[PDB]
Amino acid sequence: HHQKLSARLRALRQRQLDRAAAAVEPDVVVKRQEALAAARLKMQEELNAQVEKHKEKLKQLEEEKRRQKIEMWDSM
């Protein structure tokens, strides 16, 4: 029966359309923004973790450089 085929497509269509319209419902908008803000923050803390690890490395390395110069006078 054809009306059973049509009804099925009709129902799928409203569903799809409603899914498409859902992206710009206010609640969806906010959750999308919350999601993106959350991923951002995750990354910001990780960038910052790295920044500080590298800065620490710098100071270690700068001290290793001081050691070497000092070592140089104190063998002389």
Author numbering: 47 to 122
List sentences from the manuscript.
Mammalian p97 (also called valosin-containing protein or VCP, cdc48 in yeast, and Ter94 in Drosophila) is a highly conserved AAA (ATPases associated with various cellular activities) protein with a homo-hexameric ring structure; each p97 subunit is composed of two AAA ATPase domains (D1 and D2) preceded by an N-terminal domain (N domain). VIMP, also known as selenoprotein S, is a 21 kDa ER membrane protein. VIMP, together with Derlins, is thought to contribute to the association of the p97-Ufd1-Npl4 complex with the ER membrane, forming an ER membrane-associated module in ERAD. Here we show that VIMP has an essential role in recruiting p97 to the ER membrane.
We therefore used the fragment of VIMP encompassing the minimal p97-interacting motif (residues 49−122, VIMPx) to investigate the structural basis of its interaction with p97. First, we obtained crystals of VIMPx alone, which diffracted X-rays at synchrotron to about 2 Å resolution. The structure of VIMPx consists of two long α-helices (H1 and H2) with an elbow bend at residues V70-P72 forming an elbow angle of 132.9º. The minimal p97-interacting fragment (residues 69−108) we identified is located in helix H2, immediately following the bend between the two helices, overlapping with the P-VIM (residues 78−88). Although the elbow angle (142.7°) between helices H1 and H2 in the complex (D chain in the ND1p97L198W-VIMPx) is not very different from those (132.9° and 142.2°) found in the VIMP-alone structures, the directions of the H1 helix (defined by the swing angle) in these structures are different, further supporting the notion that there is an intrinsic flexibility built into the H1-H2 joint.
